[PDB]
């Protein structure tokens, strides 16, 4: 079995720039039997390059593949606004036919700090027996951010889930919501509900909190 690795993880550029994408293989690939694909959020993949370095029909000029054996490249010379998506290198040499973990091409913009907001659980939900505290991180860049839940300055982990949006087309930013879920009983046992956010657009961590009631 052959394993494929791509670099970097995400790639942050702007329309009109050159993109250089990598694919380190752990073994040799039949002369040059590696493919490149495009994928936009919630859509079927799209073959772009076959046999390491051959454009599929329809695929525009800017695209091109290079290298063979165990090391491969994909290169977009001038980025178009439609060329921002996930890219996957795939080998069709030896079974099982394997894919890479992929590379994201996102729009690079100037850093933006998150607008942090915290919502206490509704009246209606507290009747049903469970409490959900939502922490919202709005319109921030880059995507890397931390959320640390605190309940009476006892740090939490395990009892919350989170979820990030896809990059906004309007302002090139992301948004993340985190939900701290625990029972009616557990929510009443405590006083302070804090949400500590550590994004690089902040000088130091930010804490948004509320006292129950």
């Amino acid at each position: 079995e052959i394993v494929l690795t791509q670099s970097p993880g995400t790639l942050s550029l702007s329309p009109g720039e050159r993109a250089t994408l990598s694919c380190r293989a752990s073994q040799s690939v039949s002369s040059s039997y590696l493919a490149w694909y495009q994928q936009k959020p919630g859509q079927a993949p799209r073959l772009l390059i076959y046999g390491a370095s051959s454009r599929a029909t329809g695929i525009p000029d800017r695209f091109s593949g290079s290298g063979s054996g165990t090391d491969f490249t994909l290169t977009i010379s001038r980025l178009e606004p439609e060329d921002f998506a996930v890219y996957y290198c795939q080998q069709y040499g030896s079974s099982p036919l394997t894919f890479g973990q992929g590379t994201k091409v996102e729009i690079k913009r100037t850093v933006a700090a998150p607008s942090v907001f915290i919502f206490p659980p509704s009246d209606e939900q507290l009747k049903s027996g469970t409490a959900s505290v939502v922490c919202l991180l709005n319109n921030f860049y880059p995507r890397e951010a931390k959320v640390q839940w605190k309940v009476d300055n006892a740090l939490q982990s395990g009892n919350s889930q989170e979820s990030v949006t896809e990059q906004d087309s309007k302002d090139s930013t992301y948004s993340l919501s985190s939900t701290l879920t625990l029972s009616k009983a557990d929510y009443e046992k405590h006083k302070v509900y804090a949400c500590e956010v550590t994004h690089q657009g902040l000088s130091s961590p930010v804490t948004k909190s509320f006292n129950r009631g």
Binding site: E1, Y37, Q39, A44, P45, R46, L47, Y50, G51, S54, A56, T57, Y88, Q90, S95, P96, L97, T98, F99, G100, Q101, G102, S115, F117, F119, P120, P121, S122, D123, E124, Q125, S128, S132, V134, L136, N138, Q161, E162, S163, V164, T165, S175, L176, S177, T179, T181
Partner: protein, 213 residues
């Protein structure tokens, strides 16, 4: 120019089997190869098997081998993908991909088929309001099954500044989702805000008025 149409999405209990159909129509090339690629939510691309329907030859992936059979009814050009002995890990969107012409340079894909493998059964969502802090407000679509759901605001009248976040999977096996919207502070005690939550699978549409409490 061929037209690949996949079967409707479905939900199966663990242990059972699934059969995903993929209809093809058009394209003179009657020597085509069919590939089946799945994608678990958030994860990369994963190949499963490939068949050349005409020849009758078919390969499979090391991982699944035994659990997966790929058949083809040559008369209606419909490819098939049967995965048995299902586990939670098998929850994914599944794609059929047709490859035409010598090198296989012609790229054609199905729309994808969502297979949800879970114990817990079809249930409606409970919409809880996230009361306002420009000020931010939103809804919490909690405890539904299966995916997807659709959230809009004022029947689509408010679509500016809305963030619907990807769902998360709770330990209960049900999905939780939150929608938020940045609105003007001044419009609070004057303008009506209602989120419309549509859940086609469970046959449930619920509207909820969000206001300060």
């Amino acid at each position: 120019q061929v037209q690949l149409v996949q079967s409707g999405a479905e939900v199966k209990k663990p242990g059972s089997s699934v059969k995903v159909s993929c209809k093809a129509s058009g394209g003179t090339f009657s020597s085509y190869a069919i590939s089946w690629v799945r994608q678990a939510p958030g994860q990369g691309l994963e190949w499963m098997g490939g068949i050349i329907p005409i020849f009758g030859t078919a390969n499979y992936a090391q991982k699944f081998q035994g659990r997966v059979t790929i058949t083809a009814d040559e008369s209606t050009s419909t490819a098939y993908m049967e995965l048995s002995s299902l586990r939670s890990e098998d929850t994914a969107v599944y794609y059929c991909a047709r490859y035409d012409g010598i090198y296989g340079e012609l790229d054609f894909w199905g729309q994808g088929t969502l297979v949800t493998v879970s114990s817990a059964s079809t249930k409606g969502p409970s919409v809880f309001p996230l009361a306002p802090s420009t000020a931010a407000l939103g809804c919490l679509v909690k405890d539904y099954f299966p995916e997807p759901v659709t959230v809009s605001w004022n029947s689509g009248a408010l679509t500016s500044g809305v963030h619907t976040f990807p769902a998360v999977l709770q330990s209960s096996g049900l999905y939780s989702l939150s929608s938020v919207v940045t609105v003007p502070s001044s419009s609070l005690g004057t303008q009506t805000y209602i989120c419309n939550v549509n859940h086609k699978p469970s046959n449930t549409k619920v509207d909820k008025k969000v206001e300060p409490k």
